[PDB]
Symmetry: D2
Subunit: 329 residues, 4 copies
């Protein structure tokens, strides 16, 4: 037997005895992902066929994939009639859905993460976080400022050697791989659980001069294990989706802490950190800022940044112990 | 207008007054690359059918798509009636082509490079180097033990966010992107030249305790520039084709020097180092082991390894100077 | 805005306040169609790659597309958990679904009609008819012997110049075209209605010597209009799905009456005639055996044959008047 | 092994000691055919964006995919640098290639044949005929007014249940099927030969009142065989490429003789009749107007029409004998 994302989502909706609004929401996001996947695998042939350049300027008629993807996602969520407020990396303010197409869900997303490095063909992806409209007030961007802990569903689509949709909900994480021949996501990893301890650390060491004492010490341990065990391997694709997915599948740790130029980290809280933290915790892993759990942070701005350390529970705990080791001696 | 790889190869063969053998050899590689690309984009799906039940156990790594990809390349190369000797990373001995299908080219290739990175969907690729049999003797392993400097054609196929075929010949380097809809590689970057100086360094710093003094001093200088400039950003996909292609496009430096387990480096000279070195040099970059030019090494073993440092000339030269500074002490 | 089959079916299910069982059934049939479409567009490359021949013999390991498609459809309907009894052109007896995967729906289908002429690449398709389990008895093939008039849903997938899924339900006929790039059926014709009168007649005239008086007279009228109007055009693809779809879109009439070798017509009642009659009537057209409406026939055998005349209401009525013109003078 | 069209063409060019111009011309056609095929399989979708609002109105028929397909062929042919004169069914005058892109071949083609059959998704195709400029003069329309007998290459692409490219040259006829997954045409039928006698006749019998005595007597004989054999089955897709390809594969006869509106037939001699006639003859079949061989007609108008009867030799000869029997009275 083979399970398609479409069937899995439908059956989960039925068991949840939902009204079918969330199901439509997920179906819509899935369709969006397939369209973005198709475009990504041919990005260079589009950004050139219809004029091009070397700079980074988007217009009206001819716009980059980044804008395209964002337009596609928004259009599909508004058409699902399941949302009321949308938050995107590409929009300064939150998008309030038209009353006539208004649903009860709030969606935070990164339409095409790592796109800034699409030129070198490195993996890129789409990150999403879904919230249930809490208050009865009129839809507003405050509705998208709920802590990750209130997430009903979260995940990402990774456009790497293959395209994958990782979906996490209250009962677990499942990975579905896209078969481009039939346009169907096939379940290939059920109820994923990250291993307790890994052997790979992921961080941009070019910021070494700006790292805090704890991180500086942790990296040294990975290279020079005091107990003389085997040093960890290092991997840093430069694309959050790619690095996190590898962490999820092979275990280990991924880090993007605060430093000099980034006193509060670089990764965005609403559509980058929370979703990834949610997937991690649902997989038995940890996601912390180094002092507090990411999902517990109280968001104050939709574009707020946040430090993030995540991955295997033992590796993250080890780093947590180092942070605790530092303070006011 | 829009130039397809098929048209570009044919016209180059015509200008060179070739008998068509090499043109046919290249046509065959392109076809094989498309087939591998299609398989890669759904590798996880092709699987799932009762494998065994492994987790880590340091041992077997031979994946199914690895062998199939190899068999495809071999079958396609023999069928081209343009080769006499084949060297694959998957075959312990050189493959000698039967008399009837024998041509005059020697092909060294890595069918599907990027081992520890398919299960996590990291970018992977196919690497190739082509030599003209420089002998009147009966075809044998010796015909493949030529220095990279003798290559008449070299390149790689990168299965990343998109699929790219990069071809380098005497005339220079060109990048063609695969449009999966029509099965045609479209020329998207002509006569590629590498940036004289980059701002990214690429290496697995996990082997830090095993690095020689030159590499060690170099890494520190990238993190703590003595001239107080902005430090280099770090990137290491863990897939040679992915890391090298980013070096080609964004510039900078890629490094895989000798370490404990790899006293002479890890990367294979014939089908990993040489092709990448040839591409870099045709693009105006440099490829050194730290002491000598990769392309000028005369191999004695088809599976011989070699340390490699490649990328922007100013970046590679700066490291070269460190090496000779220490050697001058 | 653009409507996908997936969304249309979901929204229709919700408005119908269904439990989601029929929705899953249609989603499953849709997925099946995409897989069959993919195989059909490459049929000749499969029936050859894995051995071949000229005869018509299927085995165990290597079976023809016909069997493949049938295996795919059955497997997908049993996995939808929405059916209890299945009737296929390829199976002598009805298939009683396993209790554990038993649903309330009865499905009659022609997995790959016109496949016998796949060799010439003529259009082929998949026909389906869906019934609601009436009695409370144990599932049996008598459950599939309901008159077409009891159809809840019916339609077909046409694999022609493009792939199309035509779905008919109580409120109308809608056509969705498959976009092979994203694996999605896009709504392209809403609530289809056949024109009142056409200008094309479709029948195999090679059976002229075996036609009854009425049909012989009707064909003469189309070629030699008594009122000297323009003679109708003739079209006969030889594939029911193709001929009917054209009739639906361009109007006119399609005929496969009884003759010599076929005293009761050739086309099957359960998975060929009824579904097409249902689509026709739902589109404002007519489907008659020449004396009685197809949907009103009381099926007595799952493989029963039946004469069928269908298409524009005025063209079919005209022929009905001719039949009435003949009897016992 | 598996032979791709790309490899088959190249090797044939090599055996012929061609300079590569014709090989490049054929490579270009193949690429264009793949692009048209992809568009065709989703033509209905490419549309939908505010056309106008027509129903029947005997007038405009020029579809959008018709022009785009034509522009593609032209652009692709000029870019091949192998042609000097082009004749398209869509251009009122011959297209003369600019000096810089001028080669020595003349190409007559029908970009997307199958007018009254795309909206109903009937099979459609692309037809082509290639001539060597047999003149030292300045390229002009005259270079295309050669008799079919002078063709150096002819064929068609059929977008049916699958996409097939049929190529005929002095050596014979070969059929290649397009694998849309890898964008390669696979040789599936080598040195095709037509059945000496078929059991299918193909004609639009709607013009019955306009048929000459020979065609009339022939049709009756197919329905009421004087030797009491089984009558021929009838087939008429309404798309020349579809009907002709079935004639090639199953054998039999295809007919489109002169009628009222078409006193000299409907089908175009240069880019419809001749290519199909050349294919038939290279396959051992016959192609006649009823009085003379299609390939021996010297055209005087590039858009000239001609009656055509083609297919199995015994079937075509039997009709030929009827024609001469009447002419002998
Ligand atoms: N497809 C689904 N998968 C998982 N949980 C679902 C699904 N549909 C609905 N639910 C759950 O049921 C709640 C109500 O669904 P709805 O009526 O569609 O808004 C959602 O907020 C989820 O907690
Ligand atoms: N398609 C081509 N592109 C570039 N150089 C070519 C091509 N075909 C032939 N050559 C050159 O011509 C030499 C002889 O080609 P061949 O006769 O095909 O073995 C090759 O070794 C190349 O140096
Ligand atoms: N997706 C749907 N589209 C149209 N009608 C539907 C749909 N789902 C359910 N229905 C109608 O509601 C009935 C009960 O649905 P169910 O509970 O799924 O068996 C069906 O027999 C149909 O008449
Ligand atoms: N690919 C090919 N297949 C078949 N015949 C070819 C091919 N290439 C060249 N020829 C033959 O050689 C002649 C001269 O080719 P060219 O020098 O390319 O114009 C053509 O007109 C054909 O008769
Ligand atoms: O170059 P840096 O500072 O390491 O940033 C890399 C990070 O930036 C992002 O692109 C954020 O958009 C992430 O995908 C990635 O992890
Ligand atoms: O894990 P390590 O030691 O950094 O090695 C990674 C390298 O190995 C390979 O996977 C093959 O040797 C390369 O693609 C990659 O550059
Ligand atoms: O060759 P005949 O007798 O006209 O039969 C054609 C009919 O047979 C079928 O193939 C039945 O399987 C129909 O698709 C088609 O309409
Ligand atoms: O409708 P008619 O007169 O039979 O003509 C159909 C013929 O016309 C064409 O559509 C083009 O003239 C051919 O493809 C087909 O054979
Ligand atoms: Mg981002
Ligand atoms: Mg390798
Ligand atoms: Mg049938
Ligand atoms: Mg035409």
């Amino acid at each position: 037997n083979i399970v398609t994302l479409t069937r899995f989502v439908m059956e989960e909706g039925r068991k949840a005895r939902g009204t079918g609004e969330m199901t439509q929401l997920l179906n819509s996001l899935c369709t969006a992902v397939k369209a973005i996947s198709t475009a990504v695998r041919k990005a260079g042939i589009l950004h050139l066929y219809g004029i091009a350049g070397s700079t980074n300027v988007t217009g009206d008629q001819v716009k980059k994939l980044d804008v395209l993807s964002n337009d596609l996602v928004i259009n599909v969520l508004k058409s699902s009639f399941a949302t009321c407020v949308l938050v995107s990396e590409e929009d300064k303010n939150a998008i309030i859905v038209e009353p006539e197409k208004r649903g009860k869900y709030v969606v935070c997303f990164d339409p095409l993460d790592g796109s800034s490095n699409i030129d070198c063909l490195v993996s890129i992806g789409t990150i999403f976080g879904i919230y249930r409209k809490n208050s009865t007030d009129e839809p507003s961007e405050k509705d998208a400022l709920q802590p990750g802990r209130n997430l009903v569903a979260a995940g990402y689509a990774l456009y790497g050697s293959a395209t994958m949709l990782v979906l996490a909900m209250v009962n677990g994480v499942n990975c579905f791989m896209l078969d481009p021949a039939i346009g169907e996501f096939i379940l290939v990893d059920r109820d994923v659980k990250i291993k307790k301890k890994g052997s790979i650390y992921s961080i941009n060491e070019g910021y070494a001069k700006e790292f805090d004492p704890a991180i500086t010490e942790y990296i040294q341990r990975k290279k020079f294990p005091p107990d003389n065990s085997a040093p960890y391997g290092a991997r840093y694709v430069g694309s959050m989706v790619a690095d996190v997915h590898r962490t999820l599948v092979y275990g280990g740790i991924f880090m993007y802490p605060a430093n000099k130029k980034s006193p509060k980290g670089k990764l965005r809280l609403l559509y980058e950190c929370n979703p990834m933290a949610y997937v991690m915790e649902k997989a038995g892993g940890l996601a912390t800022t180094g002092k507090e759990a990411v999902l517990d942070i109280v968001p104050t701005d939709i574009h707020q940044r946040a430090p993030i350390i995540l991955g295997s529970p033992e590796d993250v705990t080890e780093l947590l112990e180092i942070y605790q080791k530092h303070a006011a001696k």
